[model samples]
Every structure is written in C-alpha cells, then in structure tokens.
Target: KRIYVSYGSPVIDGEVDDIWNNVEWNIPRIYSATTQTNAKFKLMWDDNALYVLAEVYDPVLNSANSTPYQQDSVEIFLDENFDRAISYQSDDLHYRVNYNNFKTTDAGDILRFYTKTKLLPDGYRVEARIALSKKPINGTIMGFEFQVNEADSSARRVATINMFDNTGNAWQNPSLFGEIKLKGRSDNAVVPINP
Candidate 1:
C-alpha cells in the first residue's frame, strides 16, 4: 500500500482502454533469446515483505544442472520503480531466486553447497537465504543510498527471490506487470498486494 503504480496510458477517469489492447505476441524480447523465457509475474503488498510470484512454464524438462543453481523453475525480478507506466521513479534494481518444484526450506538457512554423485544433491533447505524471512529486505528503493539510473543497486530492490514449489513451478510466458505508488510519501515504491 506504499508504492506508486504506473501504466503507459494516462489514468484518466480511473480507467484505461483495454478493449482493443491485446496483441499477438508470439515472439519475446532479447532477454528470452539465450535462456528459456517461460516466466510470468504477479504483485502483492503487505506491511513487511514485498511479495512477487513467478509462474514459469517449462514443458521441456528441468534446466537445473548446477549444484547451487535451480531446477525446473521460475524466477522474479522486482523493483519499486521500474514499470512501463512510470518509467522514471528514481528507484530501481533487480534480484533473482529460483526453486525446484520438489524443494522446501529449513527456516534459518543459507544456500551453500557440497555434492555427491547426485547432480541435484544440494538440499533445498540451504536455499532460504534468498527469502526475506528471518532476514529482511530493506529494498534498493527505500535505502539511504541506492541509485535510480546507472546506479549501483547491488543492495537495493535487487530482487531477493524465495522459491515455493508444490511440485509445480511458476509460469513465465508474458512478462509481469506492477506498481503501487500512493500519495504523500517520500518513499515511492510498489509492493505486492498479497503475500
């Protein structure tokens, strides 16, 4: 409830024309060229954590080949001011976390790995450091010293992802959309509507 939302069109009369807005999009941006771009997004907001959801649609197979990396999955890239509407909010960064559909967290843990013959032997419990639980995400947007454009956002909304798998990963077909700008606040950021 503490962020500004943006869209390409003006928010005239509290509405925009979506009646003829849908387009045929069989291609994707260059970001999806090298890697499988099968992820979608949703935004939610709460008092504590800024929630994001990545629904990845990978029907090929699990791409998790690394030890501390991810398996069949979806990822999220979040920021307080990076939507297409308000493209100039002066606060933006990105981070990512991935989860295999067959994983779980072990509460207070960080993901470091050692391995055996099993290619996927790295325990899911080790991947909890990517979440904003037990620890918190101050956000690259609200920090005392982060950047907007060409700024080093290594510590900002540099998305810290948490993976939740119910034997199914998130979908990543079309890119996601979000913003949550409110009035009368020095800190303008978009947060997830639900956690």
Candidate 2:
C-alpha cells in the first residue's frame, strides 16, 4: 500500500472547543480512537462552504459498522462552523462519504445509513450529509462526512473521513489536520460532485 498524500496546508479557523482537545478533528467533528487505530484530518474554506478530509488507516479493515467486518474508508463533515446543541430539529447534517471500495454515498444516505448503523458493506463508498442548526445533535464518535461545495480541481465537495480495509486490518493511522486551497472563481474551474 502507499503512504502519504499529494499536498498539505495549514487550516486557519476561529478556534475549536475542548471537545476536540486533540487526536485530530475539525469543528465538533467526531473522532473514534476506540474503533480506529490511527487517523489524520484536513480542512479548507472556499467561496462557498468549508471542506475537510480524513484518511482513516487501520491494520484490520472492517466494513461492518454494526457487525465486525473488515474494511477501510473515508468520511467528511460540512457546515462545521455551527453548533446544533440549541437546535435539534432545526439542525441538519451536511457531509459526504467515500469508501476505499470506491463507493460514493450521497450526503443524505450518509446520514441515513449511519443512523441505521447496520452491517457495513465491503470496500469503500462515498456519501454526503449535513446538520445545519442549533441542537444537541450527536452521532458516532466519527461524525457524518459532508460533500460541501465543489472540489478545487473538480466539482467534488469535501468533508471528514474514515478509511479502512477488508480484513479489518483497518489501515488506521494517526489523526492530522490540514487545509485545501481553492483558486479562481470561474465556472469552468467548477467541478460537479455527486453520486
């Protein structure tokens, strides 16, 4: 397997609370050190919403969120700037998911699928969801992934991530935070990110 990403940048945000004291995460973004052996994090603010990404690595991959299947995948979080403790029904989930299996789950499914917490399928799948409001909205230590806005090189939004393998060896890794930069405000430069 390969280790190391293409680029890296510093993420400048207002200031995360103590909830994310360490272990690497954005906003009230979720982090499960129990399930994940190690992890890494990154984020960026473009013309629209904010973008964050995670490369969840593990030795024993598991796809079963409910069961104990082995697999590795990535997740994303959106509109992370807001706190939904005071807004429950008002709050909504905006994020995306990308499984190492190369599967892409829409933001909506990401929320629903996670809510089910059923047995996860094999390989990696991508999805998106969001919770924009003020309420005590809680989720797995690893929150939902958001595909907010379009990616820099393409129209693919980004968000928090959890990536693992099949044998449950989970290519889990240490959590690290960074930023993604966007340039030029042209339509052609805009890429479409969807299921």
Candidate 3:
C-alpha cells in the first residue's frame, strides 16, 4: 500500500501528532507469530528522510535490551532499491527497535538512524526517521514490511507477526514483501496493503 508523504514534518520523538492525521495504516488481522498483540503503522517521507510510526498493542511489555531480534520489539524491513532479491543488500535495512526494561534496543551497526519509542498503557510506539540520499519521486515503489515480536516474562520471544506473508524465507526474499508507494503530499488516498 502507498504511504503518502506528509506535508508537515513530524518530530522524531516517538509522539503522535497532527501531521499524522492523514496517514493510513494496515493492521494485522490474524496472530501469525504472536498473540495478545496488534500492530499498525504509518509512513511519511520528506525531502531528506522517511518517517515511520508504528503503534503496537499488547497488555504486557518486554524488551530485548541486549540482543535486538530476540525479544519483544518491532522490526522494519525496507528495500529502498526495490530489487526484490533473494538476499538482502546494503540498501536493504532490517531495523529493530524496542522499549522496555528501562532500556532501548537498536539495530546494531546498521547505520546511525534515528529511532525512539514510548511506552503506552496498552502497548508501545515506535518513531524513526531514516535518512535518505534523495527524496523518492512521486509514484516511486519499494518493498516494505514490518514484524512485531512479543516476549513474555521469560524474556524469550513467544509470539511474532509480520505485515507480509512470511511463510518461508520471507525475510531474505524481498519479493514476499508488500508494496509501498510514494504518493506526494496530497489527500484522500487510502491504500490497502496485503501479503
């Protein structure tokens, strides 16, 4: 689905604002790899960066304060080049962010991208601004997906769900991801993202 670019920029502080008023989201319906959780996201782009805002709902909160991908967290899989390859390239980013246990988890050594999170009563929020060399042109298409990892008291991941159909080698194969189009600053375009 297309995530239209926002006319006004939003602070990368993990807070929801009026700038997101027009942003739309694709919410997960079934609990694929996780339970007791709901995931939804909105993406915006400016001239120099792409903003990602995700709100995940859960009764409990857990964080992988150490290793990122191991516990409760959110992951954004982006293929800016839109190559749809079997393996990830340098431009293909697998970014992880977590907020819990009084610590924040980041994607290790990938890049110094801006990421922050806020804890909520039901779940948490992820706000990130990924820098880009150039603003994507209108009608630009890319491969994109997201995952929500849920960990219980044991600090081990128990349930996991992704925006796309991740049946086999989904993470490695960009073709399995959904589409994200760059609709310029406009209004009233609700796109439905699917597997």
Candidate 4:
C-alpha cells in the first residue's frame, strides 16, 4: 500500500496537535518483542522538504546509546529515485535519530534532514524535516520504510518494519519498501511548467 499527504504541514514540535488530526499511518506489530509496542505517524510536506511526526508508545524507554539504532529509536529509509534495486545507491538514504533525556541526537549528513524529538511521559515523539529531492515528491512515487527498535534491557532488543524483506540487510533492498506517493502540495509551493 502507498501513503500520501495532502493538506497542511504541522509545526515540527513534539506535540501531536490538531494539525495532524486527520492524516496518520497505522503501524502494526510486525515484530514480537519482550514488551509490546504501539506506533503510528503523520506525514506532511512543503516546497522545501517532507516532514514527519511519529509517536511511539512504549512502557519502557531505553535510550542510553552512542549507537542510535541499538537504542529505542526510529529509522526512516528513503529511496528517493525509487529505482527498485537490490542494493543501495546514493539516492537511497537511511536516517536515524535517538531520543534520550527528553532530547534528540541526530548524526550523519546534515543536508539529508533535520530531526527534533520530544519525550513523552509514556512514549516519545519524533519530528523530521526531510528534503524533497526526488524531482518533487508530488505525482512521484518513492520507496519508503519505517523501522523501530524497541529495547528494554541494555543489550538485547526487538525490531519492527513497515514492510520487511526478511534479510539481515533490509535497508539496502528497495523492493521491500512500500511506496510514498505525495499528492497535493501541502506547502502551497508554486510548480514549474514544462519547457
């Protein structure tokens, strides 16, 4: 299935406010872990970039990590060109952010996206500002996936994906990911006409 965002873009804050009241993605329990986890997210876009607001409901939040993927974190995979290849190319990007002590640690290519996180009393909220570089997301379908790593103990953990490829290196495979087909320009940016 494909996901699309039409209306307005929400401010990149931790709160799940009225801006995201209508649009949301239902993330099911893909991986069975020691503790149960519930997660869902909202998508929005402007002329400059794509924005995401994700909320993870976890009873126990383990986020002490220099390695973000090892902690209770979220990952966003974007195959912007959507070549549907078996391996990753420069257009394919894996962006991850860690939430610890009510703050977020975003590392790697700053040009990729800007990340902000807010810790909740029970779970956490992540806001990502991603560039719309795939020749404009509107009317274009891009390969996309969302993954979450839930950890209660310091060492072990469970992982879940929106669409799993059953491979140790799932991120590299574009065929495994679902499609993100953005519809209207939520940012109301002007589009260029054909030559």
lDDT of each model, Cα atoms only?
0.26, 0.29, 0.70, 0.68
Tens-digit per-residue lDDT, 1-195, candidate 1: 123312122111212225213311121122312333233332322333443322333323333344222343323323333333222222332333333333322211223211111112221111111222222223323211100101011211211122221211112211132323322223466776895
Cα-lDDT of candidate 2:
0.29
Per-residue accuracy of model 3 over 61-154 as CA lDDT, tens digit each: 7653355665678777777888888777666766677764233323223454688888888888988877765467667777787788777776
Q: Pick by lDDT: which candidate is best?
A: 3
Comparing 1 and 2 by lDDT, which wins?
2
Instruction: Name the candidate that leads on TM-score.
Output: 3
lDDT of 4 by residue, 1-195 (tens): 677765466676666768677776756445644456778877776656777788888778876655666688777777778887887776777777766523232322557677778878788889887776644656877777777777766644566544434454655576777777777754555688978
Q: Which residue runs does candidate 4 get wrong by more than 4 Å?
A: 32-34, 101-108, 135-137, 161-168, 186-195
lDDT of 2 by residue, 130-167 (tens): 23232221220222232211111222222222332222
Distance from true location, Cα of 131 in model 4, Å = 1.3
Runs with alpha carbons beyond 4 Å of true place in candidate 3: 1-8, 64-66, 100-109, 186-195
Model 1 spans > 4 angstroms off: 1-37, 68-70, 77-195
- What TM-score does each of the candidates earn? 0.31, 0.32, 0.82, 0.81
Off by over 4 Å in 2: 1-36, 64-71, 79-83, 86-91, 94-98, 101-195
Which pairs clash (backbone N, Cα, C closer than 3 Å) in model 3? 33-159, 33-160, 34-159, 34-160
lDDT of 4 at 104: 35
**Higher-scoring candidate on TM-score, 1 or 3:** 3
